[PDB]
Amino acid sequence: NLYFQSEARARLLGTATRIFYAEGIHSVGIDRITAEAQVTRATLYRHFSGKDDLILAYLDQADRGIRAQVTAARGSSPAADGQVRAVARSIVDGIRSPGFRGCAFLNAVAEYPDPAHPVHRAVLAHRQWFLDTVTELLAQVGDGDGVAAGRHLVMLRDGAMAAGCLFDPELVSETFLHGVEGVLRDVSE
């Protein structure tokens, strides 16, 4: 459904995911989450240690889903450049999907700016994994180490995810794919 995608626990996690992703975090109270999840507050605390734990579980779901999708993209082509293209296509398919609302991690970090906050740490860990992954792919496309190119590809991805819910998603996706082709060309020379 969304780009990264006990019955009571599943309803809680699914509801928190949907609402936090679409609407934001601080503005969304556990009373609304429990009401929409059709559980009580006591049931929420039976599964999660509080709102913070629930937020982290939401982000963990997103992390796991994205990792699976990026891994599947890497599995979809035997060629390093084909794998980069497949990752880029996955990103676009998310951007153009109904209910796209930007990067879950960039949206969370806007609200959790203290670097040592667990939400902030989760954001940085996910981002570093993604940077490492695309850097490694690009290192296999050309003779160089892919380090500068990886940063470049991440910059394009960050701008695409940010603008995809603020500007025509078809146009954002077109610009992003052209940018990716340019990075692939750049490293091949």
Added chain:
Amino acid sequence: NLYFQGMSPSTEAAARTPSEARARLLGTATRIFYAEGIHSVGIDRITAEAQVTRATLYRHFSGKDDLILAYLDQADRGIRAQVTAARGSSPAADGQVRAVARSIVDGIRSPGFRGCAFLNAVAEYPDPAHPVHRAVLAHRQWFLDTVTELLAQVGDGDGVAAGRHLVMLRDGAMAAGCLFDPELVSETFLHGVEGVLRDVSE
């Protein structure tokens, strides 16, 4: 000073704002909302740190939303001034793009950088009907129009694709500038801008 707080717009704002109480309110809201976020920061925090009563707040602003919009308006004015000054600093269309890019980098590298004020606000105000969302889109469209018009003057084409590309790099740079080594972010961004300039020139 925050990245959007230049001498010209700040001085002109001061001339428009003879109330010291109003100035403390706006300065306090700007500092805290920018650094920390918006929903998590109550008007009770702003009045305390602005050293005014709640009744003084409401004498100057109609509520929290009015104050948020005033903060974003000052950021908008400050960035417009900086970008327009950057365009004034070079007579050449490509030099103007490079100057705008240097202005962006200067902000990213500045102490207290905490990302794009507008991207951070819209993360918290996703409802397109909300005045904060509308303000963010208005600022962004002005910026896209501005760089598209510059790029249209660098090469023979209309600069439309190039302008969207430059905005994508800018958005990525602002988003990552507080999440990654700002010097490395700046280097990547400037290299990207050079690539866009080359692309439009053929």
